[PDB]
């Protein structure tokens, strides 16, 4: 169908090759489904910027703007868990 | 307007003291006994001539009876 312009062929030929490249990565990850942390189903889809909803599972999760979990938001959860364990133990 | 289904209710309605007027209509196939009460206009579709006569005797003489035919009054 297309050689390399997969999802950004809807933009035609009018936004610059570099800009169409950057928006392609974000638009693919924004429209994909993610593994739902409570029922382990590929059933989470974005409803609004920052709000993700598990379809066959009935849960609303706050997340990144275009991805369910951000890299910055994942290390922080790891960091707080380590901090809490150290504080709770002595 | 409301429609009564069987013969028992119309006589109970006729014997009831809530009646106001009676109009009888004869059609090409059936006879309708429209009882004008205070609120609704109950009607009864009758196809048996003998049962129609029983109804006509059930009408108290004090009430006004209007007979309608192919020509309206």
């Amino acid at each position: 169908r297309t050689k390399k312009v997969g999802i950004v062929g809807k933009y035609g030929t009018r936004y610059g090759a570099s800009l169409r490249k950057v928006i392609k990565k974000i638009e693919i990850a924004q429209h994909s489904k993610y593994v739902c942390p409570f029922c382990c189903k590929e059933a989470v889809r974005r409803t609004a910027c920052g709000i993700w909803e598990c379809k066959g599972c009935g849960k609303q999760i706050a997340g990144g703007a275009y991805t369910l979990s951000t890299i910055s938001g994942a290390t922080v959860r790891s960091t707080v868990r380590r901090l809490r364990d150290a504080k709770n133990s002595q | 307007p409301k429609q009564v289904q069987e013969f028992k209710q119309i006589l109970k309605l006729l014997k009831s003291g809530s009646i106001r007027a009676v109009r009888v209509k004869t059609n090409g196939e059936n006879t309708k006994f429209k009882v004008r009460c205070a609120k609704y206009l109950y009607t009864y579709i009758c196809a048996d001539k003998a049962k129609a006569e029983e109804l006509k005797k059930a009408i108290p003489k004090d009430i006004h009876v209007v007979e309608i035919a192919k020509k309206a009054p």
């Binding site: 928006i23 920052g50 707080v80 | -």
Partner: protein, 246 residues
């Protein structure tokens, strides 16, 4: 000359905030005994989209520590919160994402958000999408703690200021390139009237200090003192430097 556009902005006639569909004021609940000396548990009923801001809002429901009824609060979502989650607010709250703790109980290195600059003022710092503040150190002598603001500045607050543990949801919002003028037009649907910005050089000498002559150019340096009156303060203000940074 005329009155420039920055002068007309301070009167607030067509530049008023377009806040009609907004959910409300997003903040911590008012401080009380049960938050000072105990913990109150709230339930995250739902996560909603507040117009004009990039982070989602959580409709938390505390109960009523002193009367009968419900205390419907409206928090700013931390990343990872989900519907039906329980969150605890108070001095004895556990160090979990979404919990509200005084900034003195957080271990040094904890990442917080929606911090109160003054005790009980219901949230000031680290409220935009994906933003957070880090606890630097404590000082039990005068009950003060040091935090690192999202701009990099260091600020000292009282050790009993409240904050929510985690990261404000909706991060990475501004990395997606707007592509069309129309898309930028829709961004200010629930904001002020600022978008289509005419360059000062394209105006006339009456309209703007930059309004030029036979060639589109400024003419005088664009770095100005802080003390310039409103009307000529156009461009870089109190600029310690200029040019591309190295």
């Amino acid at each position: 000359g005329r009155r420039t556009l920055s002068q007309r902005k301070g009167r607030g006639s067509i530049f008023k905030s377009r806040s009609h569909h907004k959910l409300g004021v997003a903040q911590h609940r008012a401080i009380d005994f049960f938050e000072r000396h105990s913990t109150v548990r709230g339930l995250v009923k739902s996560i909603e989209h507040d117009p004009g801001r990039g982070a989602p809002l959580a409709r938390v429901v505390f109960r009523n520590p002193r009367q009968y009824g419900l205390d419907k609060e409206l928090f700013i979502c931390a990343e990872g919160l989900y519907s039906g989650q329980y969150i605890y607010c108070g001095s004895k709250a556990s160090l979990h994402i979404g919990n509200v703790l005084p900034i003195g109980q957080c271990p040094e290195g904890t990442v917080v958000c929606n911090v109160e600059s003054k005790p009980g003022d219901r949230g000031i710092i680290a409220r935009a999408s994906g933003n957070y503040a880090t606890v630097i150190s404590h000082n039990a002598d005068n009950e003060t703690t040091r935090i690192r603001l999202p701009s990099g500045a260091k600020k000292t607050l009282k050790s009993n200021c409240r904050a929510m543990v985690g990261i404000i949801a909706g991060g990475g919002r501004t990395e997606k390139p707007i592509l069309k003028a129309g898309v930028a037009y829709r961004m200010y649907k629930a904001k002020r009237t600022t978008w289509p910005r005419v360059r000062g050089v394209a105006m006339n000498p009456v309209d703007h200090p930059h309004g030029g002559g036979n060639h589109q150019h400024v003419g005088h340096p664009t770095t100005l003192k802080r003390s310039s009156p409103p009307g000529q303060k156009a461009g870089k203000v109190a600029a310690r430097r200029t040019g591309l940074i190295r």
